[model samples]
Target: GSGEQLRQQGTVKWFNATKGFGFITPGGGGEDLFVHQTNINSEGFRSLREGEVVEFEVEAGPDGRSKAVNVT
Candidate 1:
């Protein structure tokens, strides 16, 4: 498969602006995906609010686990 980015919508279970990382509960149901501020698709202030619904792609992380990226 090429140019096929499977995106998913999820809710921000919790995010710590200071910590710069958090977990997202997938709406489709599954393990919470890890999300980092750096991976977030935003401008200056990149942060997510608790319970905020967002869309993103599941990307493989350096830890060899799925993480959320291109969050919006």
Candidate 2:
């Protein structure tokens, strides 16, 4: 496996603005990256919509998940 630190481009699989969370389907291929409201670039508007294209950084979670960071 790779070092788990790199920029990835993908479309948002799902997101709940009220819930503040979602999932991203990595471009080309790979596991879904967990999209958290906390990591979004905007303040107070930290939410994504399904099919929204975004560029973000990948960080492997210790608990068997991939986190989307630096998301825009």
Candidate 3:
């Protein structure tokens, strides 16, 4: 088992609270990472705001693309 988890910081590109999904641009520079409402750790609502910096873990998703998890 060589599953490595790297925590990262990024800026929110855009998030559709209606659709419950969005993308984040890595601060270190890379392809945008997919983010879901469920993955967001919020007090009231699980959602992300545009232009906000977030700390999260990048993990390989089921679709083979990267996803943002444990977002705060």
Candidate 4:
């Protein structure tokens, strides 16, 4: 789990305020990671448009979804 903890930088691909979730595609490669409002920090969730750069950690959520953690 050492390498698994590494954080990655990416850009927001899409977001749905109604659903309170979004998808971010990694800066390098690989599939996009899911990001939920709950996972967002206290700063509050902002509308993420396509190509908006972001940073986060990937982790499996309780709902069995691969979500982006510690988004900033």
Over the stretch 1-72, how does candidate 1's per-residue lDDT look in tens digits? 589767777666566556777677765576766667656655576455667777777677678976556778
lDDT by residue for model 4 (24-67), tens: 66656778666676656565545546776777776775799775
In model 4, state the lDDT of residue 63. 90
> Candidate 4 at 68: error in angstroms?
2.9
- lDDT tens digits, residues 1-72, model 3? 266757677666566666777777765666876678656655575444677777777677678986557876
* 1-72: candidate 2 lDDT, tens digit per residue: 666557777676565556777677766576865667666655464444577787777666789976557777
Off by over 4 Å in 2: 1-5, 28-30, 41-50, 59-66
Q: Which residue pairs of candidate 2 clash?
A: none
lDDT of each: 0.68, 0.67, 0.67, 0.66
> Which prediction has the highest TM-score against the true structure?
1
Ten-residue region with minimum lDDT total, candidate 4: 39-48
Q: For candidate 2, give the lDDT of residue 12.
A: 62
What lDDT, from 0 to 1, does candidate 1 have? 0.68
- Quote the positional error of residue 61 for candidate 4 in Å: 8.7
Candidate number that wins on TM-score, 2 or 4: 2
